[PDB]
């Protein structure tokens, strides 16, 4: 509810990288909360957006994107080269219970660390 | 790569529910692998599909859906009432390194168990 400084822990290929986030307000036009890493240049900030919805049927989505940049020799400022987009979209109904909603997110969260997807993302192997 | 019987562990609101999956072949029309729980009636099966792509830019998606059903009194067979859809879509580029790809999935996997999203999914509170 009251969004705060969410800090992750032990993430990315070795468990040796941490991450902090700071809130960056709520966009009143569409109700999308944002979180960002306190970087140096605001163009280079690992951004995480989250938005629940209202009715039809319920809808939750999380859009997370990380840019990487390299210093082009023709300029002094760094320029953004590429991103890595990702997003989840949960869709429930009016009659969804609490346990049945929690089952989905915990299944997805534990399935993202399976020996299937670590081969399907880090090396892009099909099945 | 070689997909096998993926078993999860300690998932959903208490850590007391486990889950097993069995492979159900690869659809040759679009290259979408499938996994399912060995249920009684095949209409009631918690299904998990995963598909990496090829080029443009790379694309990985995981579509997971769980149905729930109740026995209507007018019939003997159970009928499906509602689902709980979910899907992730990772998008990388040609020049994405290994570490930078793993960072995204581990950040998402550890962020799905934050004290932010457990309030944003299990009670659907906004921020």
């Amino acid at each position, epitope marked *: 509810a009251k969004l705060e400084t969410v800090t992750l*822990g*032990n993430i990315g290929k070795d468990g040796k990288q941490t991450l902090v986030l700071n809130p960056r307000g709520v966009n009143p036009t569409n109700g999308v909360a944002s979180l960002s890493q306190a970087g140096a240049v605001p163009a280079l900030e690992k951004r995480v957006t989250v938005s629940v919805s209202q009715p039809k049927n319920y809808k939750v989505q999380v859009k997370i994107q990380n840019p990487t940049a390299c210093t082009a020799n023709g300029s002094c400022d760094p320029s953004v080269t590429r991103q890595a987009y990702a997003d989840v979209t949960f869709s429930f109904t009016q009659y969804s219970t609490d346990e049945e909603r929690a089952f989905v997110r915990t299944e997805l969260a534990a399935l993202l660390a399976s020996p299937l997807l670590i081969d399907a993302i880090d090396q892009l192997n099909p099945a | 790569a070689k997909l096998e019987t993926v078993t999860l562990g300690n998932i959903g609101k208490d850590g007391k529910q486990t889950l097993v999956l069995n492979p159900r072949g690869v659809n040759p029309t679009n290259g979408v692998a499938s996994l399912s729980q060995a249920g009684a009636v095949p209409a009631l099966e918690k299904r998990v599909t995963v598909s990496v792509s090829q080029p443009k830019n790379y694309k990985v998606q995981v579509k997971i859906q769980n149905p729930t059903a109740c026995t209507a009194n007018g019939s003997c067979d159970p009928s499906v009432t509602r689902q709980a859809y979910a899907d992730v879509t990772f998008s990388f580029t040609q020049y994405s390194t290994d570490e930078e790809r793993a960072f995204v999935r581990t950040e998402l996997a550890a962020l799905l168990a934050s004290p932010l999203l457990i309030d944003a999914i299990d009670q659907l509170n906004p921020a």
Partner: antibody
Amino acid sequence: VQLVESGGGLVQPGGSLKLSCAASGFTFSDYGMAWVRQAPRKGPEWVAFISNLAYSIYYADTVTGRFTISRENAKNTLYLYCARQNFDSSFYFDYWGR
Amino acid sequence: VTQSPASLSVATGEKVTIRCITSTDIDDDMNWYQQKPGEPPKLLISEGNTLRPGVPSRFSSSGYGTDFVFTIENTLSEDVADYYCLQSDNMPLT
């Protein structure tokens, strides 16, 4: 800012215990932690490093029971020495309990 | 897989060499704790050469993958206690 262990001392061979460990002002989020006790002959034993968010868990070679769990209700951890790592993600750790 | 040399004290006015050698891989991170016989231990200069405050500047180490040397100073003060070495790779991590 400290942190203190608690637990039994006369367990029967075959049974099990539940070590408790309470925090004292590092807010018990934001920070990973671990269990390591010692024999009376040698100090640094195994590690069962918990995540910050109870996501990345792993136990050491002596895994038969010995489950680590973290609950942010009374800032304690349950387990069936109690140390914690620093702010940056790493695997060294600095503060200790008795 | 780590290893430290045998127990020694020599004198109360000299340095002492402690060799942490590791046969698994190459490491940039190798930490040192000290165990006085009254309390649970306390770290020092870990991640190579950080030297977190609370410990005096007399302590030192150097090294790299598969070789680390730890040494202090001459006229080293009293109340010796044993020193332990461990690592931050390979999740059991000794």
